[PDB]
Design a protein around this nucleic acid. Structure first.
Lengths: 54, 109, 117, 101, 154, 142
RNA sequence: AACAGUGGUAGGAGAGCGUUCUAAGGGCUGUGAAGCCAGACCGGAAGGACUGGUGGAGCGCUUAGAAGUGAGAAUGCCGGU
RNA sequence: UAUCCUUGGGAGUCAGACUGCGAGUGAUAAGAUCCGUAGUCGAAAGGGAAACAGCCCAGACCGCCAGCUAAGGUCCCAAAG
RNA sequence: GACCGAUAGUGAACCAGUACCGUGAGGGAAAGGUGAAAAGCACCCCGGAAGGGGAGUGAAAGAGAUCCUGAAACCGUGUGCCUACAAGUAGUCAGAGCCCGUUAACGGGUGAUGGCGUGCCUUUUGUAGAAUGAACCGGCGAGUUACGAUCUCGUGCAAGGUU
């Protein structure tokens, strides 16, 4: 229940390969496009199917 | 080819590299949208320093912002605050509160 | 008087660390493990300096054996015939050179075949 | 070409070739000669038994020096035994002038 | 010493139960701020030689001075006043450049007062001659009146 | 001064017929040919051998009572899983690997040995599908 | 010159390298001292150069003489990670 | 080619192990104990015995891409019928 | 003063018997250096501020407030050569291919593949040990002095040496 030996740098760096985050799924709005999220109402001018709700 | 630094903003460097990896290499206009659509905690700070670099390029060198791309986007580490937390049976383990330096360089493509 | 003495320690350690360049991982960074690796490497170098003389002759003999077998002989019979005939004092190294560039190797082979009878 | 016997070794030589051999006598700019040709090749094979009568190779001396440094270190595990020693080995540099026969 | 350092006699912790090197006083030679084992101690450095050896040494030094023509013998050596200009003029008049001892016999006060500011010269009485200043001064001035005393004592 | 070789090698294709030959009395010279001990330009770290193709693998033969004596064990990694099959059924059903096992047994171990084994070809029957390489006959010394 | 010899623990004997201070004498630095960092130099070893960068005021040589005289291990002490 | 006297007596050492030969104790057993005698290890690397302190051959000043042999070996792994 | 020079020298070069610990007697730290002179950054730009980029002072601003020099462990960014069929005390000897050019030298970097190869110290008759010790890096850390015996060497003088 206690590590037998210390961990080197190669093993640490190898294990961290999948610890990362991806880009968001985003697209611009037809009116005053501001590169909002897909299937969401934008907060400045990404007017979802009409007016810009917020 | 202007730059901007943060210098001892209170955040752990390992958690800021996670976003600075995302932002590096892209084009300046696209960069801000990704930065303010990401839900992490370092995004407002990185966005502020990037805006400062763009403004430096605009005023001091008359370089225009329709071409800029991000060339250097590293994160360093700064001084540490050491605290304590009492455990069972009078033990008093140790706690670290880390800090980081943030640097961004913008260049004309 | 009191004597402090730090620069001597730093120099003496940096010499070993510069001697251990190219090693894997921490063996090129920390003093204690680099020292041990350097000493082992010295021992190995001595032993292998003897062994390389041991192992080049084997390759020489194998190539001579192949070339002699191409002619209808063995290495042992060819060597006996050469030493028995006109005392050719050519070693094995020049024999291999003459093998890889032959038609001069064959002449010595018939010279030995003549005396083998 | 020819096969000669210099030092405690055997060398194979041709025109214009530069050779590194064991320390001979001294002095540069001199024209040393070897007289132990064992085999003259080329187009007129002259095998010798044990040498080629009336043969000699002339060469020119142009440098004397010492090879690169080697450090010899040995030790025994436990027992507290160490030893260090340095070594540089002298040589002589020559160029082949004319192969007689 | 280890026992002179202002510090503690009690021991910092127990010898068993906890994993730690057994330690007594926090003022032991290995601790940061402990005592110095051995080290400099107040003492004397002088010693003595038999008298005939001393006589031989002084004779040898002031006889080897003669070989190199480094002895000048004078007469009288009177100064009217204690000016430092006069001594410098006199020294220049005798081709003296480096250090130079001056030996008299009568304990002159004008000679002692002058030449005591010149950064190379040294004035001594006939009884005060010893090995170091003779071998450390190149030229050696001396008066005949002092010569008699020197060669009459030994 | 001795001449090593690299990327200057030349290979050839040899056909060997195994009709009445003994199992282990030809799989040793075949191994020697595979490694490349018969060339004066042999080099221990370069694999200067050449390809061989063996036909009529069904006609090899043993001596004594080896047709029922020899046994081939291939324990897997599970407990109690030690399989076995005798040499007679090995020849009647799997001649190719019967020869390949011996040839591989008389070869060095490591990456070079695995490449040298890669350059072998064993067939049953009398015909081989390699006529584009234009192979030639080889008569083993025996 | 000619012959002979050169594994080594406890241990005996011999010859040497570096550090700090003192004495002699001699000489070097703001046109760049010490320290620090590189390199493809030299010596049988312990060691010693040279060149470039940094630094921003000291430092070396020869012959003697003194010693708080050389670190990889003590479940060693202190600090940083 | 030695021993032998003196001095520094300057030292260190006082549970040795296994193999061959001759004995004791003991089931007449021991990788057991205890003696006499030769060797090696200790404090000895290199070749052989698959690996293998004490077994067989043999004693490492340093360099060489030279030659002859010892114990042991010559179908392939792996030098040579 | 052939004494120390900030882990040294007093426990204390700094608001030290202080801060902390104990009911009490009592125990007892860490912490020096901008520049010759504050001449200690008016003004402009990003930012809620902190912090920056210019412009200025200065011999120096990489000298900007724990501000002389600034090593190692530790953490990162870019790039020349290798790496997804391989069994490794991580080296050493042999060796192609590729990229470079030196205190010019039978040069420098990386290395597909082949041979050989059970860390260091301590203690034992005997250890790769499944016998003991060390997370790593840096600093500190152990045969001295005084007074008596005895021997060799160098002197001085000798049947007389020496206060």
């Amino acid at each position: 229940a206690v590590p037998f030996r210390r961990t080197s740098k190669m093993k640490k760096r190898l294990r961290r390969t999948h610890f990362k985050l991806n880009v968001p799924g985003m697209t611009e709005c037809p009116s005053c496009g501001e590169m909002k999220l897909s299937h969401r109402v934008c907060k400045a001018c990404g007017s979802y199917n009409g007016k810009d709700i917020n | 080819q202007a730059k901007a630094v943060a210098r001892t903003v209170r955040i752990a460097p390992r958690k800021a590299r996670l976003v600075m990896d995302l932002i590096r290499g892209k084009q300046v206009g696209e960069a801000v949208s990704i930065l303010n659509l990401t839900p992490r905690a370092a995004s407002p700070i990185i966005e502020k320093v990037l805006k400062s670099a763009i403004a430096n390029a605009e005023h001091n060198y008359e370089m225009d912002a329709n071409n800029l791309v991000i060339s250097q986007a590293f994160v360093d580490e700064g001084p540490t605050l050491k605290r304590f937390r009492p455990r069972a049976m009078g033990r008093a383990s140790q706690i670290n509160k880390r800090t980081s330096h943030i640097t961004i360089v913008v260049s004309e493509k | 008087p009191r004597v402090k003495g730090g620069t001597v320690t730093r120099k003496r350690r940096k010499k070993v660390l510069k001697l251990a360049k190219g090693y894997f991982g921490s063996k090129h960074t920390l003093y204690k493990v680099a020292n041990q690796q350097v000493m082992k490497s010295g021992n190995y170098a001595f032993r292998d300096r003897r062994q390389k003389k041991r192992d080049f002759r084997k390759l020489w003999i194998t190539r001579i054996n192949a070339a002699a077998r191409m002619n209808g002989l063995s290495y042992s019979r060819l060597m006996h015939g050469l030493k028995l005939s006109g005392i050719e004092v050519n070693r094995k190294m020049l024999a291999d050179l003459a093998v890889n560039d032959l038609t001069a190797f064959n002449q010595l082979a018939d010279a030995a075949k003549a005396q083998l009878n | 070409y020819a096969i000669i016997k210099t030092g405690g070794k055997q060398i194979k030589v041709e025109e214009g070739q530069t050779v590194y051999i064991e320390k001979l006598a001294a002095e540069a700019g001199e024209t040393v000669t070897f007289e132990d040709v064992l085999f003259v090749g080329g187009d007129n094979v002259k095998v010798g038994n044990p040498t080629v009568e009336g043969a000699t190779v002339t060469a020119k001396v142009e440098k004397q020096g010492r090879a690169k440094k080697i450090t010899v270190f040995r030790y025994k595990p436990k027992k507290n035994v160490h030893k260090k020693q340095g070594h540089r080995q002298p040589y002589t540099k020559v160029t082949i002038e004319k192969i007689n026969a | 010493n280890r026992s002179e350092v202002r510090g503690g006699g009690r021991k910092p912790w127990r010898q068993k139960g906890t994993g730690r090197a057994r330690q007594g006083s926090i003022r032991s030679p290995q601790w940061r701020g402990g005592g110095v084992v051995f080290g400099p101690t107040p003492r004397s450095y002088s010693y003595k030689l038999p008298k005939k050896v001393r006589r031989l040494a002084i004779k040898s030094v002031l006889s080897s001075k003669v070989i190199d023509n480094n002895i000048i013998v004078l007469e009288d050596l009177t100064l009217d006043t204690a000016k430092t200009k006069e001594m410098a003029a006199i020294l220049k008049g005798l081709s003296v450049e480096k250090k130079a001892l001056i030996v008299t016999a009568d304990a002159n006060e004008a000679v002692a007062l002058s030449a005591r500011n010149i950064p190379g010269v040294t004035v001594v009485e006939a009884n005060g001659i010893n090995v170091l200043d003779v071998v450390n001064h190149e030229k050696l001035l001396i008066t005949k009146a002092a010569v008699e005393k020197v060669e009459e004592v030994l | 001064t001795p001449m090593a070789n690299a990327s200057t090698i030349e290979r050839k294709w040899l056909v060997v017929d195994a009709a009445g030959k003994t199992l282990g009395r030809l799989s040793s010279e075949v191994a020697a040919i595979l490694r490349g001990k018969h060339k004066p330009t042999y080099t221990p770290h370069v694999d200067t051998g050449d390809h061989v193709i063996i036909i009529n693998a069904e006609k090899i033969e043993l001596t004594g009572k080896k047709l029922t004596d020899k046994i081939y064990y291939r324990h897997t990694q599970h407990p109690g899983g030690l399989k076995s099959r005798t040499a007679l059924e090995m020849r009647t059903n799997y001649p190719e690997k019967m020869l390949e096992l011996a040839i591989k047994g008389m070869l060095p171990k490591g990456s070079l040995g695995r490449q040298m084994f890669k350059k072998l070809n064993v067939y049953r029957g009398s015909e081989h599908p390699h006529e584009a390489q234009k192979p030639e006959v080889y008569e083993l010394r025996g």
